[PDB]
Design an enzyme around this catalytic site. Structure first.
Site, PDB file in Angstrom:
ATOM      1  CD  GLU A  63      26.777  65.381  35.820  1.00  0.00           C
ATOM      2  OE1 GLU A  63      27.189  66.510  36.664  1.00  0.00           O
ATOM      3  OE2 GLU A  63      26.688  64.609  36.166  1.00  0.00           O
ATOM      4  CD  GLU A 110      29.859  61.673  34.650  1.00  0.00           C
ATOM      5  OE1 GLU A 110      29.591  61.749  35.782  1.00  0.00           O
ATOM      6  OE2 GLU A 110      30.241  62.214  33.694  1.00  0.00           O
TER       7      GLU A 110
END
Lengths: 472, 472
Positions: A207, A372
């Site tokens: 991320e 995720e």
């Protein structure tokens, strides 16, 4: 809804959020100092919870792997903390990073003799401890994915308190300093040299979009270093692209395995048809970090982190993400769609995952792993529906051609949610942070059924239907 | 928290709420006519949902027993509908019911020759069909408890529409007519004569307190016949006591098995210490129906139906059950305690069950089975906590001396909730009433773990803790 025989089921963890909790696991980093900072705590920018009261995975990994194995899991994506491996600076150990005139890394070389110079200033005890963790999983015949970077930086790399006060020219400035990328390359090579025998697939970073956008633009997020500068966000983004490329090259020097990147992908929707074209451009821009990596031939796979959507409409002559949808919904309430919102205020929107995977397949044509997906749900009221509905979304996208290799939930256990602390509980498994005891949530039993059978069996099929959790 | 080796786990059903749903199963009764009545539907007194769109257990029993067996269940308490077995009147077939001057039944005799007279006017096909249902469970090596009465009456016994309009002297008036008791005795003997070989334990009736209090006092309930008369409630109560005693005697003529009664037990609490003694009197009075039966030596066991509490305080110089607690909480919301309330507005209050079992143990010293416990929870958000917390309550009461022999949840599947219709979904298993398909809820998986292991294992122990479902 049956998945392929080798489709992986598992979970993901990060070092900062899981490792600490019991004596002998504390490690300093930018994020450590940030969450301990008295101004940040007193202003409510961070929660006051502290990561050294967390789930103590540094000590308790064998017991968590036992839970994971019994839930039918066969893959874990984990982390390794730079701040642990190199607690003292690596600047004086020179390597060859070749760049073009435009600042692109074209090659790296970290020779064996230099790996040995690095060993002498590394914390080799921490490296061996990570081996014990990863090996405990691998020895069970399971898959391990190692992600090199999951936000904390060594303090000699980034001193965020000093950066926010005096500016990035006055202190170690993290991804605003070119040389951070070079130090990251040394780390990447060091890790691959040593740990490749324990690793099935690599990720350079997790991320990176959250790092640069929250650190330098969306300051209400309470991310380090928290000073507002679009130029800084762009510079950190540029440097993180190069950090990926350098790390990819570093890994490939010492590994034949696939190297990817893990990215935060919001799904973007127009509130109405009139905004459709504008939202299509917003998608392109929001995902451009990945597009760049793919276009340079530096992505073997993509880790998809998906949680919710953003819905766009006009507000004061400007197109903006709207309150009451997606990530901007009421905490513990309902989105304007009637869909439930998590404890974090994130709308349950599995359609977004289906749309996303089809879009990513078409855009990049790469193998993908859902690295995720999960929800803040401290009582497990909604997680079972979240889990099954999103797994059905993945199945549906695969039927339309998406090459998805596995699904990793966020996460096995409750953990430390950054600036929110412990109040956001994302686990299939509840953790009492005072005792460190683990307790299954019913979603864990649902997971076990699906993972063990490689399918959403018909008796669990109604958990994909959100009718009875959706208002009106 | 381990239960004894022969502690039973299972569920309960009733005829009216489960049987109908597919062609061939419809049967007339007072309750059938009541829920089909156009005035009742238009006034909102009943829901307009109809039982003949229900789960179709008459046809699908083998498939539901399969689910039950796989959930580790070893006991079912079911029903048998008087309105099915004797669709035409039995009045002309005489038996010997001896009464004292005070109206107590002292003895019953339904001779074999009279059982054979009854066969000629019974629906023997229905009786054989019930045998197929019960035997399907019994053949698996499991326990069956048969409850003789679960609210509907034959229409020749009770015409509630006519009673409400013209008064009980003008039409068949159900438990207001002394002869209903005598006809019930004939039924009880008939059932025991034939079905004892399939039955492990008997119950004469289910929640007689609900029948008399809701039918004749609490008219907002939308129970038949729905005219207000305290005298009528008292007469129905007196007759239902005698129906229990008559049926007990009838059964014992043709069975050596235990005969009990299944009762609705609200737990009653004072809002404050000043109301304690008054609430103790309210308990005595509310449970007096069972006290009477035990005192006459006509109870071998007690079926405890427990769902919630009532909390008492002063309002207008009068002690009353208070809005915002117990059964009087907001639907889909929270009680004033902060505890979640079910879709029916019933507060999650497991402490009530613990207190109740200790009270009943001390009061009667009888074997007890939890014959109903559950919650209206259409998306399973709260049921897992409800299930485990009430099971821990049972465990805790047993540790203090209560003789509890098993726990039967209400219920295995969603079913027709009386005047509320299908909107109250009490199943471990969801039923699509259009397709009749069954789908597991996560609470079903939780139940399976506990039942199969005869214990609340430590990994599920946190489901007994209501902190993360309780507001502020």
């Amino acid at each position: 809804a049956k998945f392929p025989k080798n489709f992986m089921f598992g979970y993901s963890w990060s070092g900062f959020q899981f490792e600490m909790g019991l004596p002998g696991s504390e490690v300093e980093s930018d994020w450590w100092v940030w969450v301990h900072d008295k101004e940040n705590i007193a202003s409510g920018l961070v929660s006051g919870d502290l990561p050294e009261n967390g789930p103590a995975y540094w000590h308790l990994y064998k017991q968590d792997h036992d839970i994971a194995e019994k839930l039918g899991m066969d893959c874990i994506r984990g982390g390794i903390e730079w701040a642990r491996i190199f607690p003292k600076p690596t600047f004086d150990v020179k390597v060859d990073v070749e760049k073009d005139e435009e600042g692109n890394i074209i090659s790296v070389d970290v020779p064996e003799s230099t790996i040995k110079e690095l060993e002498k200033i590394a914390n080799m005890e921490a490296l061996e401890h990570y081996r014990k963790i990863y090996s405990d999983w691998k020895e069970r015949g399971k898959t391990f994915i190692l992600n090199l970077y999951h936000w904390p930086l060594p303090l000699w790399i980034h001193d965020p308190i000093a950066v926010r006060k005096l500016g990035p020219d006055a202190a170690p400035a993290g991804w605003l300093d070119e040389k951070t990328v070079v130090e990251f390359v040394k780390f990447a090579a060091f890790v691959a040299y040593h740990l490749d025998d324990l690793v099935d697939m690599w990720s350079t970073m997790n991320e990176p979009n959250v790092v640069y956008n929250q650190g330098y633009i969306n300051l209400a997020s309470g991310f380090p270093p928290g000073f507002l500068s679009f130029e800084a966000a762009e510079k950190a983004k540029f440097n993180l692209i190069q950090a990926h490329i350098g790390a990819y090259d570093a890994i490939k020097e010492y590994s034949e395995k696939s190297v990817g990147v893990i990215y935060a992908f919001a799904w973007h929707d127009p509130l109405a048809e009139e905004y459709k074209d504008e939202v299509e451009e917003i998608r392109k821009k929001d995902y451009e970090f990945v597009t760049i990596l793919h276009s340079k031939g530096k992505l073997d796979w993509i880790g998809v982190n998906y949680y919710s959507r953003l819905v766009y409409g006009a507000k004061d002559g400007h197109l903006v993400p709207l309150p009451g949808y997606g990530f901007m919904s009421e905490r513990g309430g309902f989105a304007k769609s009637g869909r439930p919102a998590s404890d974090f205020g994130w709308e349950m929107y599995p359609e977004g995952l289906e749309n996303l995977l089809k879009y990513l397949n078409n855009a990049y044509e790469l193998p993908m792993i859902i690295t995720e997906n999960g929800m803040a749900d401290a009582a497990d009221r909604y997680r079972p529906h979240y889990l099954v509905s999103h797994l059905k979304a993945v199945y549906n996208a695969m039927k339309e051609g998406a090459d998805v290799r596995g699904y990793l939930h966020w996460s096995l256990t409750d953990n430390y949610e950054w600036a929110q602390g412990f109040r956001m509980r994302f686990g299939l498994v509840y953790v009492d942070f005072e005792t460190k005891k683990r307790y299954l949530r019913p979603s864990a039993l649902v997971f076990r059924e699906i993972a063990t059978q490689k399918e959403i069996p018909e008796e669990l099929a109604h958990l994909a239907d959100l009718k009875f959790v959706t208002r009106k």
